[PDB]
């Protein structure tokens, strides 16, 4: 439509002139007031996908950190995405690091950030997710759309687990899945939770808290899980790419022993030095330059877990081609972030088109057939 096209001009303009986090908040606001366009197209039934009994109408969603506070869930989903991951949230509100903390290099289609864990806190965000869930009962276009919640610990909290336990109790009833990220380069001490021993501990503790939600309520699943699945939320974990081969296999074991529901590969990276505008900057890099690193990480973990744990792709996905690399590498689902920044609101419509056409030309019957074909 012209709707998309006109908006994308405004965005390209904003991208050139205006600060990144200012732009982000501006368009989140436009989405909050529901003046963004819709993709009302039927999605190809041949590009369906799932992770266990969690079904996605199409294989593209938005990654955590994009709508941290769940203020814009409807509008973003209606751009053509099958799901969104809100957060990362923490039990208490944070301001995050000092601004500016997000910068973009257009030529390389990359971003670096040191947001450091800004969100309105779990309590307020739960009210936002509840309001959405109420809207979802009335909106034809939100049916079968999935909302995951990314959860993490406040800055100065001694134990991670006590933070996540609070988050699950408050918001776990409204979530279709829970993403645990011990993968973030913006707060010190988070990533050491990636050891196998502490991880196993965290993962178990999360499943037990979710399982406890079921036990302590007296209602049936219909009137207990105020989400889309109407079941208890799945448990994913998100991994940073800056690990060595021993760490990755050590972790790979854990995820199996815990029987986790999926792994999100990957988060941002600190190991990129060839971006000129970014040399002054600290933080984690995302976008195109993260693409090849990310994909490799999927192949590794796909092999190390011996293909029992489903994978969710994140890192430099812009095109239907990029998407297929992640799928053949072993991903069931893809998440976009940087693409929305650089390609705009058309990204979902566009990338779904490109992938559908490729699946044809590559002779795939459906998307599931292509999963892990390396
Ligand atoms: C400004 C910014 C904030 C982010 N915040 C989070 C976050 O809070 N939690 C999280 O798991 N990932 C966060 N991410 C990482 C994204 O979820 C995603 O994994 C990463 O950007 C790679 O996607 P991409 O290459 O398509 O951009 C953030 C990324 C950016 C650029
Ligand atoms: C022009 C621009 C846009 C943008 N993000 C963005 C882009 C579009 C939308 S949306 F979701 F318009 F409908 F697609 F609201 C939401 C967020 N960001 N995000 C950043 C950043 C990297 F700072 F977060 N810079 C941006 N610049
Ligand atoms: O919000 C952040 O600080 C953040 C979290 C994360 O997981 N990855 C990232 O790059 N930034």
């Amino acid at each position: 439509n012209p709707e998309f096209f006109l908006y994308d001009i405004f965005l390209k303009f904003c991208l050139k002139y205006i600060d990144g986090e200012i732009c982000h908040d501006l368009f989140l606001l436009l989405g909050k007031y529901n003046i963004l366009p819709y993709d009302t197209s039927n999605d190809s039934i041949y590009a369906c996908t799932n992770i266990k009994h969690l079904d996605f109408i199409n294989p593209f969603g938005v990654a955590a950190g994009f709508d941290k506070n769940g203020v814009c869930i409807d509008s973003i989903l209606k751009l053509g995405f099958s799901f969104i991951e809100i957060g990362t949230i923490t039990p208490r509100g944070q301001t995050g690091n000092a601004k500016p903390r997000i910068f973009r290099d257009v030529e390389s289609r990359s971003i670096i950030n040191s947001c450091g864990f800004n969100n309105m806190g779990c309590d307020k965000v739960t009210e936002n997710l509840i309001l959405f869930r109420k809207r979802q009962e009335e909106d034809k276009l939100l049916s079968k759309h999935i909302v995951g919640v990314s959860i993490g610990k406040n800055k100065d909290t001694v134990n991670i687990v006590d933070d996540l336990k609070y988050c699950i109790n408050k918001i776990g009833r409204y979530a279709d899945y829970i993403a645990i990220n011990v993968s973030s380069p913006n707060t010190p001490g988070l990533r050491d939770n990636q050891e196998a021993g502490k991880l196993k501990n965290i993962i178990l503790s999360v499943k037990e808290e979710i399982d406890n939600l079921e036990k302590n309520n007296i209602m049936n699943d219909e009137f207990l899980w105020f989400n889309t699945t109407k079941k208890k939320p799945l448990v994913f974990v998100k991994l940073a790419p800056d690990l060595n081969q021993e760490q990755k296999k050590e972790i790979a074991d854990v995820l199996l022993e815990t029987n986790i529901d999926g792994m999100i590969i990957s988060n941002t990276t600190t190991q990129i030095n060839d971006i000129k505008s970014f040399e002054n900057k600290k933080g984690g890099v995302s976008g195109a330059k993260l693409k090849d690193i990310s994909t490799k990480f999927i192949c590794e973990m796909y092999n190390y877990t011996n293909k029992q744990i489903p994978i969710i792709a994140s890192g430099g996905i812009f095109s239907g081609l990029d998407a297929l690399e992640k799928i053949e590498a072993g991903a069931s689902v893809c998440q976009l972030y940087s693409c929305l920044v650089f390609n705009g609101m058309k990204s979902a419509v566009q990338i779904k088109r490109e992938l559908n056409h490729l699946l044809y030309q590559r002779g795939y019957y459906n998307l599931k057939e292509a999963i892990g074909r390396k």
Side-chain angles (χ1 to χ4, degrees):
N1 281 28
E3 263 166 59
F4 278 112
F5 170 67
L6 268 56
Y7 262 117
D8 288 338
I9 288 152
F10 187 34
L11 207 122
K12 293 269 158 123
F13 163 97
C14 281
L15 173 57
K16 159 165 193 161
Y17 289 133
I18 315 299
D19 167 88
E21 190 155 14
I22 298 262
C23 285
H24 196 63
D25 289 338
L26 169 58
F27 282 100
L28 288 166
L29 187 83
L30 301 187
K32 165 166 169 176
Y33 292 97
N34 196 27
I35 63 162
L36 302 180
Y38 297 166
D39 167 46
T40 67
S41 72
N42 283 332
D43 291 325
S44 166
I45 59 171
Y46 300 114
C48 290
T49 184
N50 71 297
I51 283 163
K52 299 208 185 313
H53 312 284
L54 180 64
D55 297 325
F56 305 84
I57 64 186
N58 71 68
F60 300 101
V62 171
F66 194 98
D67 193 2
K68 276 156 178 297
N69 300 314
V71 297
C72 196
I73 299 173
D74 321 51
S75 286
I76 292 166
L77 278 180
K78 286 189 273 192
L79 281 175
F81 292 101
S82 57
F83 76 105
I84 179 164
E85 191 169 292
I86 60 166
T88 304
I89 54 160
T90 53
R92 286 269 79 258
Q94 302 199 156
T95 37
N97 300 328
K99 308 198 198 183
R101 56 206 175 173
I102 326 178
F103 316 91
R104 322 148 272 183
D105 186 44
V106 179
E107 268 299 285
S108 61
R109 291 181 306 157
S110 297
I111 305 170
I112 180 144
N113 88 90
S114 73
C115 268
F117 240 175
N118 59 306
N119 79 93
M120 294 172 81
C122 179
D123 281 13
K124 177 60 191 152
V125 169
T126 300
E127 302 165 21
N128 281 337
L129 182 52
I130 285 165
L131 290 171
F132 164 78
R133 286 296 189 195
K134 292 195 182 195
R135 285 179 253 113
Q136 182 181 33
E137 319 201 279
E138 309 169 35
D139 199 331
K140 259 203 205 194
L141 291 172
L142 293 176
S143 298
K144 296 178 186 174
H145 288 58
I146 295 304
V147 182
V149 181
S150 181
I151 59 171
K153 68 186 186 45
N154 272 122
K155 181 178 179 180
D156 52 337
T157 297
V158 184
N159 268 322
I160 179 155
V161 172
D162 294 318
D163 270 2
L164 315 165
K165 293 259 226 204
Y166 181 71
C167 285
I168 294 170
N169 284 324
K170 236 285 184 171
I171 209 161
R173 281 185 49 194
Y174 316 101
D176 294 305
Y177 73 80
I178 298 281
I180 307 163
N181 73 318
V182 299
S183 41
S184 174
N186 289 350
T187 55
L190 183 65
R191 315 160 82 174
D192 192 15
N193 293 327
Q194 299 196 301
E195 200 141 73
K198 301 182 183 178
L199 176 56
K200 164 154 160 171
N201 177 63
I202 293 158
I203 298 181
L204 291 188
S205 309
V206 164
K207 301 187 113 170
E208 316 214 297
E209 252 304 343
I210 292 163
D211 287 344
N212 260 311
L213 276 184
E214 183 76 74
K215 282 168 185 164
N216 299 346
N217 208 270
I218 64 108
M219 301 295 299
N220 289 306
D221 287 342
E222 289 180 352
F223 315 86
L224 158 60
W225 301 116
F226 194 15
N227 53 13
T228 292
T229 58
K230 317 254 61 161
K231 300 211 284 158
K232 75 204 185 212
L234 301 214
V235 176
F236 306 151
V237 69
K238 185 164 181 190
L239 322 171
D242 303 344
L243 300 158
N244 59 35
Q245 308 290 344
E246 186 279 333
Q247 277 158 318
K248 300 181 196 183
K249 62 178 185 183
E250 206 172 1
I251 297 209
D253 288 22
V254 181
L255 309 188
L256 300 148
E257 321 193 330
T258 60
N259 191 21
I260 192 159
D261 301 305
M263 61 185 119
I264 312 160
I265 295 159
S266 55
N267 210 311
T268 59
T269 187
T270 44
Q271 310 299 313
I272 295 179
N273 296 110
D274 53 46
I275 295 170
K276 295 189 293 182
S277 39
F278 287 7
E279 62 190 357
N280 193 33
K281 314 303 175 189
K282 61 155 178 169
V285 174
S286 49
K289 283 288 200 167
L290 173 58
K291 182 202 156 197
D292 292 323
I293 300 178
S294 165
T295 304
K296 174 154 193 164
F297 194 6
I298 297 180
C299 285
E300 296 171 2
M301 295 301 298
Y302 187 38
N303 289 7
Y304 292 5
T305 41
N306 268 278
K307 70 186 185 206
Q308 305 307 310
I309 308 283
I311 299 173
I312 306 174
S314 182
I317 305 178
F318 289 78
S319 65
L321 179 56
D322 293 344
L324 178 52
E325 302 177 6
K326 310 279 179 154
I327 293 160
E328 283 170 344
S332 291
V333 182
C334 299
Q335 303 182 311
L336 306 194
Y337 194 130
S338 289
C339 179
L340 289 172
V341 176
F342 295 113
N343 293 8
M345 297 183 202
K346 60 180 183 178
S347 300
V349 174
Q350 181 174 86
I351 199 160
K352 281 185 293 177
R353 223 200 299 112
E354 288 177 2
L355 178 60
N356 284 357
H357 294 358
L358 240 54
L359 278 169
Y360 188 70
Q361 300 162 21
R362 300 308 185 84
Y364 289 109
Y365 168 67
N366 57 7
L367 171 148
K368 291 166 169 170
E369 168 172 331
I371 299 177
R373 280 190 73 86
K374 298 292 184 186

